[PDB]
Design a protein around this ligand. Sequence first.
Ligand SMILES: CC(C)[C@]1(C)CC(=O)N(Cc2cc(F)cc(C(=O)N[C@@H](C)c3ccccc3)c2)C(N)=N1
Ligand SMILES: *[C@@H]1O[C@H](CO)[C@@H](O)[C@H](O)[C@H]1NC(C)=O
Length: 339
Amino acid sequence: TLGNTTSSVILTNYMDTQYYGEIGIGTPPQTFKVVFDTGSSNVWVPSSKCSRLYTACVYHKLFDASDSSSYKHNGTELTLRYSTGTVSGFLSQDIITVGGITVTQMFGEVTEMPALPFMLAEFDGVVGMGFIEQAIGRVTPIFDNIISQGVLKEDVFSFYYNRDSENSQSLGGQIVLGGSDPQHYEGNFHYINLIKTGVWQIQMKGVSVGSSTLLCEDGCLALVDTGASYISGSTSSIEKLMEALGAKKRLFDYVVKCNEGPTLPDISFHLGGKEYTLTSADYVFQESYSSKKLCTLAIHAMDIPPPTGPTWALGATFIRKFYTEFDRRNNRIGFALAR
Ligand SMILES: CC(C)[C@]1(C)CC(=O)N(Cc2cc(F)cc(C(=O)N[C@@H](C)c3ccccc3)c2)C(N)=N1
Ligand SMILES: *[C@@H]1O[C@H](CO)[C@@H](O)[C@H](O)[C@H]1NC(C)=O
């Protein structure tokens, strides 16, 4: 069932690595900063039942069920094993407000939240925008529950991620539920069908580094992940990519001499009909131009295990350049040049 509603959520951009918006949970609402994530399918926030021996729980907003009159107990154990690590807790149900839409939702109350990486997170929790097929504990995802209300104009949602500004007047980003915002893209959308329903993943035909370097020659997979900061490839693909760029490996990231940053070649992703090109300004964190300082690249290695991986992941680095529409009705992803 389709309605006429379109709901937008304004996002805050933290350092071009974290894009989060607000949701309200319970009666009266308890607010949380959340990443709207196409790479996962569960909703979770830290819980008041999280031991304060997990320091990430000291520095984040905690959901207190004892303060909500609309809360409904469940209690089923929940373990979410992600590429960044594990969080665990239990299931709870309450009313969630997201951009004006009110939805009764089953979510995770996280009681175990590791300092690495969550002490680095400016957000509190996660709103999984992925499919029911990948939902842990077979919990109905929030977008499926919103769709069931038959209020949305279309069975789609869109992401706009802005470049980081120091001006408070700057919109960090925007998620549209039920459509796309023509003020944040130009030209037309070009769609790529999903390999299969259940994962926001598409076929990739090749990766080009300048003129003389080529990866993904026989085709590969591309997960379009709004919850990832950087573009990621397998360890093997990234070693070849970085060698081609003249970048050196550190503990978790890759760097170039800052003065060399503006000279780096274009990187192109062949998706569906089109080539999606990122210049060095799109993937280098150009913090200085010094021959004496190292500048980080917004690309790294991540070995995603089967059945989803091995796969590349097109994170915030890609979405900043290309406004993205996630189409559930047609099982496809549309890209248009962001503005
Ligand atoms: C949002 C994040 C907690 C989860 C739920 C789990 C995860 O591992 N990724 C993929 C992924 C893969 C990866 F290599 C890096 C990051 C990542 O750094 N995401 C940012 C948003 C972040 C910052 C601070 C703490 C955690 C995560 C995310 C994802 N899509 N969603
Ligand atoms: C938790 O919710 C699920 C929803 O399908 C239900 O099957 C399960 O029995 C619930 N558990 C309790 C103890 O309420």
